């Protein structure tokens, strides 16, 4: 808070924005943004049930 | 003070990336800062400035 | 030995039972591409952001 009066927030010295946790990986399929996930599977199971 | 100033002179300070994730476009430089490392022999230890 | 010769009863009850076994068998028995072949590791992952 300045002498003058006039309240100082973030957003006065930043930019707030919600973005990635890590941004070093560009992800593509066929050319369009994508995020995948695998599947482990686990033992005793049936591979083609689960 | 001689403790504080040996952790303040003897750290790992992480400088980071000069170009790096989101960069700009056609951005065509990529490289690693170094700030501080960790000292290595009783003469470095010997010079930190105390005051 | 050669005394189911003369129990054939016998022979096909130990054939029906090795049948119904099997189809247990098939039922629940866990199927994957390879088993565990690869020895275990593991991984540990630390981050140092910059
Ligand atoms: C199920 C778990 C139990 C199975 C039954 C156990 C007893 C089997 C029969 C043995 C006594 C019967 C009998 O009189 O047989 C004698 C032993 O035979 C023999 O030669 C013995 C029989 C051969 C082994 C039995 C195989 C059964 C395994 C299947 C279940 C698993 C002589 O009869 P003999 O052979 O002289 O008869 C004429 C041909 N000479
Ligand atoms: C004379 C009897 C011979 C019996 C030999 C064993 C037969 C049973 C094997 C089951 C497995």
């Given at each position: 808070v300045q002498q003058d009066g006039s309240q100082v927030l973030l957003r006065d010295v930043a930019r707030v924005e919600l973005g990635?946790?890590?941004?070093?990986t560009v992800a593509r399929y066929n050319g369009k943004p994508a995020a995948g996930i695998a599947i482990k599977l686990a033992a005793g199971a049936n591979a083609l049930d689960t | 003070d001689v403790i504080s100033q040996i952790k303040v002179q003897n750290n790992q300070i992480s400088?980071?990336?000069?170009?790096?994730?989101?960069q700009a476009a056609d951005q065509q430089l990529n490289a690693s800062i170094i700030v501080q490392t960790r000292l290595q022999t009783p003469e470095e230890f010997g010079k930190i400035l105390l005051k | 030995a050669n005394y189911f010769i003369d129990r054939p009863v016998f022979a096909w009850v130990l054939a029906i039972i090795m049948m119904l076994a099997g189809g247990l068998a098939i039922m629940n028995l866990p199927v994957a591409?390879?088993?565990?072949?690869?020895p275990p590791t593991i991984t540990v992952s630390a981050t140092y952001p910059g």
């Open positions: 990635a946790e890590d941004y070093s | 400088g980071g990336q000069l170009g790096g994730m989101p | 591409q390879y088993p565990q072949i690869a």
